[PDB]
Design a protein around this ligand. Sequence first.
Ligand SMILES: *Cc1c(COP(=O)(O)O)cnc(C)c1O
Ligand SMILES: *Cc1c(COP(=O)(O)O)cnc(C)c1O
Lengths: 414, 410
Amino acid sequence: GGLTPEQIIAVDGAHLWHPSPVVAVAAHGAWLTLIRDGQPIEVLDAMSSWWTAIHGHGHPALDQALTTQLRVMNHVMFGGLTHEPAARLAKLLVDITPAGLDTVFFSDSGSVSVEVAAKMALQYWRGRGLPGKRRLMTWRGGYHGDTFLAMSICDPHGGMHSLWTDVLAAQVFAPQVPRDYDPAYSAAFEAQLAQHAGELAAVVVEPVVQGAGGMRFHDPRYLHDLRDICRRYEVLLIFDEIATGFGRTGALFAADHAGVSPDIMCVGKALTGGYLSLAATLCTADVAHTISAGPTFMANPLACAVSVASVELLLGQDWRTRITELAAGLTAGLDTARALPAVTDVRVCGAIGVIECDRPVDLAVATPAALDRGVWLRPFRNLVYAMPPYICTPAEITQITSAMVEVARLVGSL
Amino acid sequence: GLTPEQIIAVDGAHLWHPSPVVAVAAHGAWLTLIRDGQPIEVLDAMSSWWTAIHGHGHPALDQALTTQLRVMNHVMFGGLTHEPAARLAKLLVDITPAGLDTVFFSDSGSVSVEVAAKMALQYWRGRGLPGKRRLMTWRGGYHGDTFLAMSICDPHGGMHSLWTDVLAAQVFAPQVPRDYDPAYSAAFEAQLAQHAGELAAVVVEPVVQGAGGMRFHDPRYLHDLRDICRRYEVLLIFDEIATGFGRTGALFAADHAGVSPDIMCVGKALTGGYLSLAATLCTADVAHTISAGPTFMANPLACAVSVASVELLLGQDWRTRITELAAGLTAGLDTARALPAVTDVRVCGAIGVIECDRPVDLAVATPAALDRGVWLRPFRNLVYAMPPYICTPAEITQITSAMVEVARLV
Ligand SMILES: *Cc1c(COP(=O)(O)O)cnc(C)c1O
Ligand SMILES: *Cc1c(COP(=O)(O)O)cnc(C)c1O
């Protein structure tokens, strides 16, 4: 109890599993206080603590919503009891999500809300006398969580299905969806789906942006194709928006770029503004009713309360202009990366900026390089990318994009 | 803002549940519910499903949360570490069964069970034996509601016929009996022996099987499982998500047998019922053999309140406290032993169960206990409670009186 940074890393190295780690001692706004060679430094949280900290850390409105709920009621069991934070969050979600989503199931993590989505899809078709509809279809390059079911629909090469083969469910995979719209891709997706339709419960994809699978973007028109294909072959459409939710891609939900509603949808990550774990699975009235005819901390009051505040905070400001300024800033700051020798692509979509490199990025070099520039950056595979808090000033975005450019330079450099 | 009536309307229209009663407050061992539009204080007999061991809104746990909130809410656990995670991991490694010295944090009990299965499977692969992929358990168990966890839940309770081909097919031994019979253990070893080359691990709830029927078994069964797993080279996993942190009379139910599992899951009471957090612990052997995460992994807020809650338990003599709760439950439930619908009355530490000979109508049970100032949640033929450790003798009496009465209603 009460530990020194050196004591913390001594305990950590002996006893903690991680997903060499740097000790973090504070977080406020877009900034973390990290310990580097015995000294505290303030660095920009360029990753938003893995997509979560959309309003920054220790935002007064979320701090207060939390301590206000804490005064009244920490937690009650959602079996036989309901409460205001859950009712309030459900109403909000139902109002702001794509049209038709009328029903809300809370859970504790994004990976669990995906299992819940899949359970809804299976039970739906069983409710309709078609329990042969049990497999899932997706395209390559995706990520949906780390639980066994969620793994079955992650990219087979990235999620090491080979090291889990015959332990995972065999789902159907379409090729990687291209960035540019190609009607031939949609036609082939349709032709593959037609071959499995009677055994398929759902198509599940991340809309517009594929996150942990490789930070790829695809034309929102592909989602219009998916909606039509699914409606035509009687297969449910599930959108995983755990990473794309709450303004991140420039729309409130990435599905909004195509104007499509899925039958089932997952949200998480930025849901609580990065305070506490909370996820949600939504579905249509038809899905709920057909099924009709939980986790221990389901709908946690504390988590629902901070999330209520976070969503209202987003909604009560001109978030859309904010994201547009963030994207302009990322575009301007990353532009000089295009001409770097190791750089293969530079892409931006809302508050997401990616530098794709021609070789895997070395973390032992990249991490201290960015910290030297006052920026916490966490590359993966061949990608130097950022998803910064919406509160970042133009100067902060410039500081973030400079450190990314510099890491990318170093990637060619030696 | 919403009025209780507005909450009911929104809830009925938009919320999926495990008509619900509106809860508006929770403090100590009491909840404030709305009934007939009036707020009433009732005892949380269930501890909000095992979670609220020190009661709701405990000053020390509130302060712990608010203190961490003023310094940092959350940071990604990829590449960073922090003091809450370290303090918790050190506490957990110190207090759990000997040999468990590595901690993997997750956000729910189900996920921690999945992490345990993954550790077991990857362990044998690091041993050159990837054929060891299956899990073995006994009937009556509950391990969570994710697909992997469902595969080791009681096949009957989990409707495994209407999930056919979607769940992994695991090995099930017969229901472990309450009293100790060596033949049961000999028969478990024999079923296990047939599948040893196929089995990565045995996974059970030690001493008490919770959501699967509130059944108790002799700790000596765990001694035999430990022995059997060791001899056949199958890992032993204890799921202590419900049984942990003093609930059965020992700090961990494994302690009743004096055995250590190779992998252990904890959750529920970990944070004292404030926030969702779970942990999977494994031995050095398991960790080194494997090495040769969730978004909110090791959340500072949940880790900080857990440290407070765990220190709060250790810093009192929790062991005498649980003994008193058990005596009080036994005193208060005994009279039901001689009711016409009552099959069994059993107590294990701060857990009290009246089993009946028929399903319990909740439409009658729930309004009956509310009238007695108690929140009770019967399940199947079971009327049961696991009250906060802070309940006074008068509160236990009120709880057990309301339990005897719902049973009396047969
Ligand atoms: C509560 C329970 C679980 C599941 O935990 P969740 O947080 O609800 O996902 C797993 N195992 C046991 C023994 C449990 O009692
Ligand atoms: C992060 C992520 C998940 C998994 O969420 P966890 O809370 O880490 O379990 C699932 N789907 C997508 C798209 C994600 O980005």
